[PDB]
Ligand binder design. Structure first.
Ligand SMILES: NC(=O)C1=CN([C@@H]2O[C@H](COP(=O)(O)OP(=O)(O)OC[C@H]3O[C@@H](n4cnc5c(N)ncnc54)[C@H](OP(=O)(O)O)[C@@H]3O)[C@@H](O)[C@H]2O)C=CC1
Length: 309
């Protein structure tokens, strides 16, 4: 139950440590504690501003013999300013250098969204995406073994299908917002049908991010099932995603929560309680408000997300 299989043949551990908003001063101990506790998957990004400190914690884990490199699944992501095909391998190499790794298990296009190299998120810096050219550069990173799997993030089933149609190396993963509040049934089915793995980001509904407006652990259905099964609301949210065949990326820098977030394997949500997830109102929490704009290729939220419910 503790891994899913990618179209590359690789195993992705079902639970990964999230590192968004894990500040440099705390991320190291979080990664170190998480892997000692049994985590074998770390989700990273250049734009999280902490990959050097993650690299220092991975180095410590390897040097203390907690794990070997081959035991871990490390993900990073190509930021929106590195979409130019010549820029892709250089961005991967920057993350490899900071993480002090020879390869990533997964390198993702972070968003189907592009800005001019080295610029800030601001509408004059928006450039028309060229996802096929960017993917082509991602495929050479895969050929080189520097990214043992390549994938995408924040791609609707429409944009994922458009890319699959021209890919000589299919995306292994589409990492999207997915939790009881945003169940992604269409993309779930699409990913199952195309052999693409769905990794759930913000699987608790990112309760530490106020601008995301998440309420997932306060959902009556979640609190009820938690009370019925003797689990925490977080455990119920995480287990739901795992039973859908999705990997989850719970973020914590708290040792007790890091441990509880891995305790999602030796118990199940009965089918009758799975039925109750129907009653949860659906709302996307990470809407991409800042890349939907008259200056954007996405003039509306519908254009960015292709209408998904
Ligand atoms: N565009 C993309 O591809 C995106 C990727 N991601 C990835 O997904 C990860 C997870 O999503 P994220 O938005 O961070 O949010 P999560 O849904 O993982 O929620 C994290 C928050 O929940 C708290 N928390 C963690 N465990 C528990 C628990 N057992 N009970 C109660 N509260 C808990 C954390 O606090 P504490 O630390 O105190 O435990 C933190 O405030 C990110 O960190 C990142 O790696 C996220 C968003 C976008």
């Amino acid at each position: 139950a503790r891994h899913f299989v990618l179209n590359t043949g690789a195993k992705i551990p079902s639970v990964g440590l999230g590192t968004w908003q894990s500040d440099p001063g705390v991320v190291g101990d979080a990664v170190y504690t998480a892997v000692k506790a049994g985590y074998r998957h770390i989700d990273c990004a250049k734009v999280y501003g902490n990959e050097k400190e993650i690299g220092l914690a991975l180095k410590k884990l390897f040097e203390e013999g907690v794990v070997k490199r081959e035991d871990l699944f490390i993900t990073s992501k190509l930021w929106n300013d590195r979409h130019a095909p010549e820029d892709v391998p250089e961005a991967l190499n920057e993350s490899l250098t900071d993480l002090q790794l020879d390869y990533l298990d997964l390198y993702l296009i972070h968003w189907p969204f592009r800005v001019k190299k080295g610029t800030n998120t601001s509408p004059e810096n928006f450039i028309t995406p060229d996802i096929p050219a960017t993917w082509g550069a991602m495929e050479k990173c895969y050929d080189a073994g520097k990214a043992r799997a390549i994938g995408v993030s924040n791609f609707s089933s429409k944009k994922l299908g458009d890319l699959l149609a021209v890919a000589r190396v299919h995306p292994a993963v589409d990492q999207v917002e997915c939790h009881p509040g945003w169940q992604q049934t269409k993309l779930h089915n699409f990913c199952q049908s195309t052999g693409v793995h769905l990794t759930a980001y913000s699987p608790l509904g990112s309760p530490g991010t106020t601008w995301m407006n998440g309420n997932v652990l306060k959902e009556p259905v979640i609190i009820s099932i938690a009370e019925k099964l003797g689990k925490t609301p977080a455990q119920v949210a995480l287990r739901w995603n795992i039973q859908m065949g999705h990997s989850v990326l719970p973020k914590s820098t708290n040792e007790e929560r890091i441990k509880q977030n891995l305790d999602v394997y030796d118990w199940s949500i009965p089918d009758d309680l799975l039925a109750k997830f129907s009653e949860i109102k659906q709302a996307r929490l990470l809407r991409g408000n800042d890349i939907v704009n008259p200056q954007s290729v996405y003039k509306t939220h519908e254009e960015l997300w292709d209408g998904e419910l």
